[model samples]
Target: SNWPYPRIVAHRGGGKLAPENTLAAIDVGAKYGHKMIEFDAKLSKDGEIFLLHDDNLERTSNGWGVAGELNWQDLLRVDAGSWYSKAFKGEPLPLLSQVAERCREHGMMANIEIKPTTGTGPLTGKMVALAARQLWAGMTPPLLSSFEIDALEAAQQAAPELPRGLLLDEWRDDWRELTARLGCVSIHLNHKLLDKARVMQLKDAGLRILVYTVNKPQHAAELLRWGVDCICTDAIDVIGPNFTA
Candidate 1:
């Protein structure tokens, strides 16, 4: 495999160490020696690509209501970190370009999860893939993944050169067909849905396996031993980036 990604990836940037999907989170992930970071990317009303995990801003930002209804200027004013901690009180939502720049500065790779607002999956995916193509022009392109098949297809059409991954919450009967259709290089799944046998099945089918939100060292170790390609974890403090089985 010509996979260049790291074995351990920081979930939502620095995981629980800092406000997720913010530049501060990315920095914290890098500070903790993470070589790759995963973040959610979505579009603002005016078509700006930015880092954010939810369709609504109520959870991760000071702003309330649907996030995609706001323009870039409006989103710029929202306090993205205050909800997480007082220490991160003033941190603002980060633009995709800004995150890309920060990742480049730290010599880190990115796994961009296309998290579109309801009914905007295809458009968001197209925009993000196009922007990422330009942002990482001479560098290795970020891996694009999404649970929305329409979004992944749009990305494939817009930027086929960038590797794509299928994010699954559970195993699907048509997973093999779906991945092949999307030309995916990997499949990112919830840790609980995987087992050694399933891992072998995915590997045998020529797909890299990545598990998300793993926080326990024992679970991570077990997955690694099963030949999982990567683990995205929030416990960067406990299962540091340098961890090995």
Candidate 2:
């Protein structure tokens, strides 16, 4: 498979360094020499796409309540970085467009995880894919991925040209069928669910394998030996982007 993304990807932009899913996070990842970053994308009440992980805002921002219920303007006013640390005070929640520009400025690629809120899966996926197509025109497209089958299906319908990846929190019996139906070029899985045999099985099926949240040096080395295509990690400072097993 002609995988164009880097082997080491910074999780949620900068992992646990800067506030997750903020422009500051992206900069942190770039500073660590990461050539690629992954972040969660979801739609606001007004249909704008933004970077956020959880469905609620209380965990990562000053704002409270369900994130999807808030309009883009309201979301923008939420102080996303202060919760992480006083040093990063006033960092705003980043729009997908803002993150796109940040990635472009750093000459980095992205993996946008479609994290729809509740019933917004299909719509969120469609909007994110369309926005990505316009934002990244004339460049390598971001890989759209989701644990939601409906979201991946909708993204496929909206932007088939962009590569897609099926994200799995656990092993699924029909994983191959789902990936084939959604036209995924890669499969992103929880690192805990994978071993050498599983990695070989996925590789033999001709799908690129990406594992998430792998922060241990020894564990990452083992996965690399198993032929994992990419390792998304939060320990960017320790592993570094150029880490090789």
Candidate 3:
């Protein structure tokens, strides 16, 4: 089992500073000297991988529709940048491969969240792991994780070299069994659900802890104090390379 520590992930590649899931976000992450930036990855109909969360595109992009239905051409036509601000009016959607190239160029590792939109979970996971394995051949191996096991299993089948984690909103009574059965090295839990005792229990069991959307320095410090291994943040300005941890 592989475990990491004090890894502060920039959520959606640190949204606002750059277009979330775009090459711009990766660039922004690198600018801050972030070692590993976490971002979502899903499949379009043509089986091309890219970054984005949720089933709808309206929240982050100008295009008002489902992402899986559109091919790369349709995605390219939409202004992914305009939704955040007018300054990035014509920024096109980026492919997952493109994001990988940027990561390789900057010597950054990727925490690829295998997000499957709507009904496409399993297929998306397999495709993403396959693509990622090809891209990061013989490297440290990218981290593959998801709340959806179909996605995780798909990834497991294609790229066993990659490490997998379980994302939990709330731990079920069977969580211990589930984690052991799934063979994950860590449990990614909602920050609110964590307690110091539980955190220590997990740590002692040799599993790492990851808390999500942690931006506040106070909260991050508190979680770290509790022995959580990593915290993901949306506020790049607070958590990025500018601050020495």
Per-residue lDDT over 114-204 for candidate 2, one digit per residue giving the tens place of the 0 to 100 score: 9999899989989999999999886678988898988998899999889999999989999888888888899999999999899998988
Please name the candidate that would achieve the greatest lDDT relative to the true structure.
1
Go through the candidates in order and give the clash count of each. 0, 0, 0
The digit string of per-residue lDDT tens for model 1 on 22-77 reads 99999999888999999999999999999888899999988999999999999989
Over the full model, what C-alpha lDDT does candidate 2 score relative to the true structure? 0.91
Worst 10 residues of 2 by lDDT: 136-145
C-alpha lDDT (0 to 100) for residue 54 of candidate 3: 72
Per-residue C-alpha lDDT of model 3 across residues 24-127, encoded as one tens digit per residue = 77778777777777888888878788787877799888778899898877877777777777777767777888877887788777788888888887788889
Measured over all alpha carbons after superposition, the RMSD of each candidate to the real structure, in angstroms, is 0.8, 0.8, 1.8
Error of 3 at 187 (Å): 1.2
> Which residue pairs come into collision in candidate 2?
none
Scored against the true structure, residue 236 in model 2 reaches a CA lDDT of 90
Candidate 1's C-alpha runs over 4 A off are none
Q: What's the CA error at residue 113 for candidate 3, in Å?
A: 0.5
